[PDB]
Amino acid sequence: ASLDQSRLLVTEIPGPASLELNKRRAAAVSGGVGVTLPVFVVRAGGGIVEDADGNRLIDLGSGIAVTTIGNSAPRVVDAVRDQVEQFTHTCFMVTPYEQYVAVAEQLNRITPGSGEKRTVLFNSGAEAVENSIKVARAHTRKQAVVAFDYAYHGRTNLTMALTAKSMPYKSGFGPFAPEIYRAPVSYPYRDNLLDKDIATDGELAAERAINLIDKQIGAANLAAVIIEPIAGEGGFIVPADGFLPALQRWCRDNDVVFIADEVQTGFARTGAMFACDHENVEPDLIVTAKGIADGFPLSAVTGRAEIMDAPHTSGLGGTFGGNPVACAAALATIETIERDGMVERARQIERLVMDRLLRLQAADDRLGDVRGRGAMIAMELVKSGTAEPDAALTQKLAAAAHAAGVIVLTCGMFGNVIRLLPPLTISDELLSEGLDILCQILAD
C-alpha cells in the first residue's frame, strides 16, 4: 500500500465504477455543480490520482492549484493526526489558540514588504477577498473598488461583482453589490494586436488603466484597486513588466488601498513565495488561500498593521475561520515549502515546460501564446495563421487527454486556454509524459 508514480489505464475513462458513482451524484447533488472529469478519486499523492476503477492518472491540475506540495503531504498528515486528537474547534473569537496566532505570524513573515503587518483567517478565497474589501473601506472610509476585465475573485455576491465573466459565475445571481468599477488589464498577447508599445511597456499599460479609473471613478471616491498578479481563470495572463509597480505607486500617491489577490498565485506556485516577489511588488494587502494548507479550507488577509487594525473590535471574524486542524496543515505546508526547496522545484518545472511548449509553438502556429511562471503555465489556442480563439480545439484536446489518463484543465475568457497546474511533487518523467500526450493529440 504505497502509491505508484506511473500512469495506468486498466479501463476506459471514466471507468465502470466511476460511472456507477456518477448515478449517485446526479441523484443527490444540485445540477448547478459542474464536473470537469467525472472519475471518482480513492487516493492521490506525488503526481498521481487513483480512481475507483484502479486507474492512475497524471495530475496536471492539483485541484486548481491547491495541492501544490502534493496530495496528503507527509508533514500535513502528521500535523493533522496530532491536532485532530487535541481539539477540532473552539472558535477563535470565543477562546483563542496558539495555532491561529502561529499561522498569522508565518504569513506576516513570508508575505511581501518589511513593515509592521497583521493577519486574519477565514475559510475560503471568496471570504478573504470579501474581507480585504471590508478592511480597505474601514481604513479609507471611501466606497468604490476597481477590478480588472479578466478578473476572477469568487462566487459570493460581492466577489461575483468583482468577477468579469458572466457565464457561469454571475448569470442570474444579482443584483450585485454596488460601487464596483472595471478597468483594462495588461494582456500582452492581445494588447499587441492593437498597440505594440502597450504590450511590452507595462507602465504605459498602467496609464491606460489609471486614465480610465480617474475619469470614471476618481481617487477621492476609491477605497481599493484589486488585482491578480497573474490572471488565473481569465487565462493565466502575465502582465507586462512595469504594470504592477506602476499601479502600486499610483495607489500610494492617491490614498487608495492596493490589494494583490494571490489566492491562485500564492505559496511557491510561480517560482517565488508570492507572485508579487518577481518585480518586488509590495501591496498594502495580499489575499491568500488555495495552496496555503495543502487542501484544507483556510484563507487569509495579510497587510500593513495600520490598515488591518482599522475595523472596530469584532468587526472581522466568522465561526470556523482559522480552524486549528487547517492551521496545523498550513504550518506544515510552509515548513514543507522551505525545508524541501519547493520554490526552486517550481523554477525547474518552468524550465522543463516552457522549453517543450516553445518548441511546440515553433512547429505549430495554433499556439498563439505560451505564458506563465513556475508551475503556472498555459498555452492559448487559436486558428492557424490568425489570433482568433479556438475553443473547439481546446475542448477536444482536453477531452482526449482525459481519455488518455491525464488530468488537464482549460480556462480563459474565450475558452481557448490549456493550463498546467501540476503539484510540485510530480516527477519530471510524469510531467514529460503528460506533455508527450498533449503533443501526440495535437500532431494527428
Strand partners of residue 207: none
Mapping DSSP to helix (H, G, I), strand (E, B) and coil, where does residue 57 land?
A: strand
Minimum gap (Å) between residue 26 Cβ and Na ion: 4
Give the cell for residue 276: 508579487
Site string for a copy of itself, 161-190 (x = CB under 8 A): ------xxx-xxxxxxxxx-----------
Interface with a copy of itself (CB under 8 A), residue from 5, 11, 108, 254: 108
Q: Is the dihedral of CA 386, 387, 392, 394 positive or negative?
A: positive
Q: Binders of Cl ion: how many residues, by CB under 5 A? A: 4
Q: Binders of a copy of itself: how many residues, by CB under 8 A? A: 120
Give the cell for residue 252: 500610494
Please, is 81 exposed, middle or buried when counting C-beta atoms within 10 Å of its C-beta (0-12, 13-18, 19+)?
exposed
Interface with Na ion (CB under 5 A), residue from 8, 26, 35, 358: 26
In this chain, which stretch among 29-37, 105-113, 125-133, 258-266 interacts with Na ion, using CB under 5 A?
A: 29-37
Site for Cl ion in 176-195 (CB under 5 A): 188, 192
Of residues 9 and 177, the one with the C-beta less far from Cl ion: 9
Distance CA(202)–CA(187), nearest Å, equals 10
Minimum gap (Å) between residue 23 Cβ and Na ion: 10
Helix (H) or strand (E) holding 223: strand 222-227
Residues 6+ apart with CB under 8 A from 260: 112, 227, 228, 229, 274, 275, 276, 281, 283, 285, 286, 287
Interface with Cl ion (CB under 5 A), residue from 3, 5, 6, 9: 9
In this chain, which stretch among 211-219, 265-273, 322-330, 350-358 interacts with a copy of itself, using CB under 8 A?
A: 322-330
Minimum gap (Å) between residue 35 Cβ and Na ion: 12
Minimum gap (Å) between residue 13 Cβ and a copy of itself: 11
In this chain, which stretch among 1-9, 69-77, 124-132, 374-382 interacts with Cl ion, using CB under 5 A?
A: 1-9
Q: Measuring CA to CA, which residue among 48, 51, 60, 61 is closest to residue 21?
A: 51
Which stretches of the chain bind Cl ion, using CB under 5 A?
8-9, 188, 192
